[PDB]
């Protein structure tokens, strides 16, 4: 229960937030992006993934 | 004591024997963590034998469930107590209120 | 028994005619003694402490 | 290629609480040092705190004093909160007396070169009978963080003074710490931040004193974070004791008479490894030891299995 | 004596040595499950949340 | 009446505030409720059960 | 009064670029405090040289097309941020991409300058299609004690200065003989290769320590 609210709130999106629309190399700098208060956890974004 | 209560706590505290309740209104002559002596007011006082109601407090002692049941004085030296006032709190009762 | 016998003899204990039955405190539980009572049979001589 | 901060106005506001400021702070280091200082300041700060207490005619916490309105248990609980400061000393034993129908404040104690009663209104208890009278040995150590009455018995080794009533020790002086980094514009430089660290004390630490020991520890820690030697311990301890291990125990263990007890104190014999190898020849020559006095030593040595006067070409090995 | 030496031992004897945990109504086979023990201060059992 | 009494305290009506994690020092997204709830210890104390 | 510094610390590193350090036993609460604080400095303020701006050869806009390349303009910016740059005496260098023909432009296919060191010549910059297909441009590296977005440049590439690609600290319980609960601190880091994980931290910490030079006694 706790844990699923967690993944959901994590992988969920809102309309407009910090980070809206930027582009990233891969998840590694996605976290670097968030931890440092630049991006909202849930913000619509194009990233390179493998 | 409950920050948030409903109002019975005062009712329960007294009616349950746990607390020590003033028999007759008067003033406190003596306060020891052990006992409480009340000099009765004249109005309530019987003519002969005069004096005072003396309440001896229960100190640290075993409960049925092995909890500890101990009375404490909640009034101060030379304070007015009216008939039916809280003279000392039991365990898990504060200032006349029920505090579980 | 034998080997028990030889042991009492090597370390010199006077193996008693009396067992140890003393009331001792229960494992793990620890506190302050706040009272002692002695209940004595009607007609037994009261000990020192009693 | 970097800057470095330092502390401007440390503004006291009460004996209990002050707001110290930190001005040369670069981007977000405001929160970097700010949280991490809250974390050292709320724990790792020294404090002296009342530890044990002997009281007059009182055996243990669960009793009542005759003519006082607190129950002993409570009275120890008033002392847990007895704020104090001492300087050169590391455990002082204050003393309290007073009689007469009178509220006994933390004042009514007796001063020492080192003792500062940072709050002498502090109520310790109340007397209630003209010639009701109390005395006590309040004992105050100084240490770090929370050392609860319970953990204090492992050394034991005879805390027999039954009238000694250990209280839990809340050794600290921080109450709550609360930083905020409001952006401070030093006249030129893009944006550097301020760090108003607000705090709340028991009175017994002076804010600047604190904040330094705080960085002190932060340093000492990181000190090994710099380099990283993969360091380890040698370990692999020894599985070979030579003699019987009894020879490493102290002579108290022999549960012997006082006169013979100090005799081996004085003739230099702590460990039974030395009492074993000292004959009767050695002992009449020893200060205050006769036929009654030594008959004593051959009976306990007899019952434990050992003897007087022997050898071991090897005593004692080897750490 | 609860000598301090033993704890370093117990960790050995503990290691690869599963224990069984079982809760009240044993209903499906999963009512008993085996875990690898990890030493704890406190008188409580710590039970992994997914189980 | 509850909110009205929250005014006089000078406290938000949300009953919620912003809080910060003591560890990372950073803020918690969303307001969380904080308040005072009278709470009991029942005597199913662990070291009686173990 | 007197404090606790750790013992036993096996930095068990996978590859040269990646590393996992375990380090016990810390005082209580000291895992997170040191862990988070070194994380902040490792992440946000760590001196590095990445790429900030690029002037193109063919077209004047970030929404245009180059003839001969399947990689979009936003795409190649991404490949750039992931190129690892380390400068020597030089505070800012700019390079020329001179290469053309039937296939991908690696970083050995870059101009080799004096105070320039490319940690990955293998690094794929872009692909080159058929025939000829022309490509040369000048790309200006910038210096900073951070990670600076394309957007933060108001008067264009996200500048990923700090060598740290990723940071985490995990705090778990460590037992010292007769102490119940101490912290055991596990730091796990990945780098852009320009500096090995082992040192990044030394200096990452060195920086933090430098700020306390105003307090210690």
Q: Sketch the domain layout of chain D as residue ranges.
A: 1-46+172-225, 47-171, 257-319
What's the rounded Cα separation, in Å, for the pair E13 and E8? 9
**Domain topology for D47-171:** RNA Polymerase Alpha Subunit; Chain A, domain 2 (2.170.120)
Answer whether G181 touches E (CB < 8 Å): yes
Phi, psi torsion values for G133, nearest 5 degrees: 70, 105
Q: Indicate the CATH number for domain G48-161.
A: 2.170.120.12
Residues of G in contact with E7 (CB under 8 A): 177
D9 three-state secondary structure: coil
Structural domain containing residue B40 = 18-99
Report residue D59 as tokens.
């055996």
What's the rounded Cα separation, in Å, for the pair A45 and B57? 73
Taking an 8 Å cut-off on Cβ atoms, the answer to whether D36 and F25 are in contact is yes
Taking an 8 Å cut-off on Cβ atoms, the answer to whether D31 and F26 are in contact is yes
What's the rounded Cα separation, in Å, for the pair G122 and G143? 23
Query: Which residues lie across from G185 on neighbouring strands?
Result: G23, G171
Give the homologous superfamily in CATH for domain G1-47+162-217.
RNA polymerase, RBP11-like subunit (3.30.1360.10)
Residues of B in contact with F36 (CB under 8 A): 3-4
E29 three-state secondary structure: helix
Answer whether D65 touches B (CB < 8 Å): yes
**DSSP assignment of G4-21, as one string?**
-------EE-STTTEEEE
Residue indicated by tokens 């020492």? D112
**DSSP assignment of D43-76, as one string?**
SS-EEEEEEEEEETT--STTSB-TTBSSBHHHHH
End-to-end CA distance of chain D, in Å?
50
Task: Return the beta strands (E) in chain G as ranges.
Answer: 11-12, 18-26, 48-54, 85-87, 94-96, 99-100, 116-118, 134-135, 138-144, 147-148, 159-160, 164-176, 179-191
Query: Which residues lie across from D223 on neighbouring strands?
Result: none
- Structural contact between residues G194 and G48, judged by C-beta atoms closer than 8 angstroms: yes
Residues of A in contact with E50 (CB under 8 A): 3
Burial class (CB in 10 A: 0-12, 13-18, 19+), B43: exposed
- Structural contact between residues B57 and B71, judged by C-beta atoms closer than 8 angstroms: yes
Taking an 8 Å cut-off on Cβ atoms, the answer to whether A22 and G149 are in contact is yes
What's the rounded Cα separation, in Å, for the pair D237 and D212? 41
Q: Indicate the CATH number for domain D257-319.
A: 1.10.150.20
What's the rounded Cα separation, in Å, for the pair C3 and D38? 66
Answer whether F26 touches D (CB < 8 Å): yes
- Structural contact between residues D195 and D21, judged by C-beta atoms closer than 8 angstroms: yes
Residues of G in contact with F25 (CB under 8 A): 36
Task: Return the beta strands (E) in B18-99 as ranges.
Answer: 20-21, 26-31, 35-40, 52-56, 72-73, 80-81, 86-89, 93-94, 97-98
Taking an 8 Å cut-off on Cβ atoms, the answer to whether C11 and D305 are in contact is yes
Taking an 8 Å cut-off on Cβ atoms, the answer to whether G178 and E4 are in contact is yes
Element (H, E) at D298: helix D297-304
| Residue in F closest to E45 by C-alpha | F50
Taking an 8 Å cut-off on Cβ atoms, the answer to whether B3 and F40 are in contact is no
Given resolution (angstroms): 3.6
Chains interfacing with A (3 or more CB pairs < 8 Å) = E, G
- Structural contact between residues G184 and G171, judged by C-beta atoms closer than 8 angstroms: yes
Which of E4, E8, E41 shows the shortest C-beta gap to G181? E41
Give the up-direction half-sphere exposure of residue D227: CA atoms within 13 A in the CB hemisphere.
Answer: 5
What's the rounded Cα separation, in Å, for the pair D89 and D80? 19
Answer whether B67 touches F (CB < 8 Å): yes
- Structural contact between residues D250 and D231, judged by C-beta atoms closer than 8 angstroms: no
Residues of G in contact with F24 (CB under 8 A): 32, 36
Residues of F in contact with B100 (CB under 8 A): 40
**Chains A+C touching (3+ CB pairs under 8 Å):** no
Taking an 8 Å cut-off on Cβ atoms, the answer to whether G151 and A32 are in contact is no
- Going by C-alpha positions, the residue among B35, G152, A5, B82 that lies closest to residue D64 is B35
Report residue D182 as tokens.
């409001």
Phi, psi torsion values for G122, nearest 5 degrees: -75, -20
Taking an 8 Å cut-off on Cβ atoms, the answer to whether B33 and D71 are in contact is yes
Which of D61, D304, D305 shows the shortest C-beta gap to C32? D61
What's the rounded Cα separation, in Å, for the pair D34 and D102? 47
What's the rounded Cα separation, in Å, for the pair D224 and D40? 17
Residue indicated by tokens 């009607």? C42
What's the rounded Cα separation, in Å, for the pair D79 and G75? 70
Residues of F in contact with G32 (CB under 8 A): 23-24
Task: Return the beta strands (E) in D87-220 as ranges.
Answer: 91-99, 103-105, 123-126, 133-147, 169-171, 174-180, 183-184, 192-193, 196-201
Q: If you ran DSSP here, which 8-state letter would residue D248 be given?
A: G
For an interface test with B, give the residue of F9, F15, F34, F38 to mutate (most B CBs within 10 A): F38
What's the rounded Cα separation, in Å, for the pair B2 and D271? 60
Answer whether F35 touches D (CB < 8 Å): no
Q: If you ran DSSP here, which 8-state letter would residue G99 be given?
A: E
Taking an 8 Å cut-off on Cβ atoms, the answer to whether G3 and D217 are in contact is yes
CATH architecture assigned to D1-46+172-225: 2-Layer Sandwich (3.30)
Residues of D in contact with F24 (CB under 8 A): 35
SS (H, E, C) A14-36: CCCCCCCCCEECCHHHHHHHHHC
Report residue A7 as tokens.
């993944």
CA distance G204 to chain D (A): 8
Give how far the C-alpha of residue G4 lies from the chain's centroid of Cα atoms, to the nearest Å. 32
């Amino acid at each position: 229960q706790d844990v699923v609210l967690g993944l959901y709130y994590m992988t969920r999106d809102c309309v407009n937030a910090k980070g809206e629309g930027m582009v990233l190399t891969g998840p590694k700098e996605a976290e670097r992006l968030y931890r440092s208060g630049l991006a909202s956890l849930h913000a619509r974004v194009k990233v390179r993934i493998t | 004591k409950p920050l948030v209560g409903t109002g019975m706590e005062r009712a329960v505290a007294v009616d349950s024997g746990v607390t020590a309740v003033a028999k007759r209104g008067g003033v406190v002559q003596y306060v020891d963590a052990s006992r409480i002596v009340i000099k009765v007011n004249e109005d309530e006082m019987y003519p002969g034998e005069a004096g005072i109601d003396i309440y001896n407090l229960t100190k640290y002692t075993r409960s049925n469930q092995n909890t500890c049941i101990n009375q404490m004085p909640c009034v101060s030296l030379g304070e007015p107590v009216e008939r039916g006032d809280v003279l000392a709190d039991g365990p898990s009762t504060d200032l006349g209120e029920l505090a579980l | 028994t034998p080997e028990e016998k030889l042991l009492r003899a090597i370390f010199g204990e006077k193996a008693s005619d009396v067992k140890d039955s003393s009331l001792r405190v229960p494992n793990g539980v620890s506190g302050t003694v706040i009272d002692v009572q002695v209940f004595t049979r009607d007609g037994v001589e009261k000990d020192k402490r009693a | 290629e970097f800057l470095k901060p330092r502390l401007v106005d440390i503004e006291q506001v009460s004996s209990t609480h002050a707001k110290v400021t930190l001005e040369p702070l670069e981007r977000g280091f405001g929160h970097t040092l700010g949280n991490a200082l809250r974390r050292i300041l709320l724990s790792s700060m020294p404090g002296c705190a009342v530890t044990e207490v002997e009281i007059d005619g009182v055996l243990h916490e669960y009793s009542t004093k005759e003519g006082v309105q607190e129950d002993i248990l409570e009275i120890l609980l008033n002392l847990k909160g007895l704020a104090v400061r001492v300087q050169g000393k590391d455990e002082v034993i204050l003393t309290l007396n007073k009689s007469g129908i009178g509220p006994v404040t933390a004042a009514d104690i007796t001063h020492d070169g080192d003792v500062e009663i940072v709050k002498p209104q502090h109520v310790i208890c109340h007397l209630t009978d003209e010639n009701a009278s109390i005395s006590m040995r309040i004992k105050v150590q100084r240490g770090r963080g929370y050392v609860p009455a319970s953990t204090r018995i492992h050394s034991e080794e005879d805390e027999r003074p039954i009238g000694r009533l250990l209280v839990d020790a809340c050794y600290s002086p921080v109450e709550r710490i609360a930083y905020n980094v409001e952006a401070a514009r030093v006249e030129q430089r893009t944006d550097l931040d301020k760090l108003v660290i607000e705090m709340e004390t028991n009175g017994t630490i002076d804010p600047e004193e604190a904040i330094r020991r705080a960085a002190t520890i932060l340093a000492e820690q990181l000190e090994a974070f710099v380099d990283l030697r993969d360091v380890r311990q040698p370990e692999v301890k020894e599985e070979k004791p030579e003699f019987d291990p009894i020879l490493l125990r102290p002579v108290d263990d022999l549960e012997l008479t006082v006169r013979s007890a100090n005799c081996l104190k004085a003739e230099a014999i702590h460990y039974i490894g030395d009492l074993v190898q000292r004959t009767e020849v050695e002992l009449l020559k020893t200060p205050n030891l006769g036929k009654k006095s030594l008959t004593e030593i051959k009976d306990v040595l007899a019952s434990r299995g050992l003897s007087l006067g022997m050898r071991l070409e090897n005593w004692p090995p080897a750490s | 004596r609860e000598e301090a030496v033993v704890w370093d031992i117990l960790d050995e004897v503990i290691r690869e040595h599963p224990v069984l945990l079982n809760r009240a109504p044993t209903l499906h086979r999963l009512g008993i499950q085996a875990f690898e023990p990890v030493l704890i201060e406190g008188k409580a059992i710590q039970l992994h949340p997914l189980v | 009446e509850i909110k009205e009494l929250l005014k006089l305290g000078d406290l938000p009506t949300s009953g919620q505030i912003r809080l910060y994690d003591g560890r990372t020092g950073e803020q918690f997204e969303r307001p969380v409720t904080v308040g005072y709830m009278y709470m009991l210890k029942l005597n199913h104390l662990v070291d009686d059960k173990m």
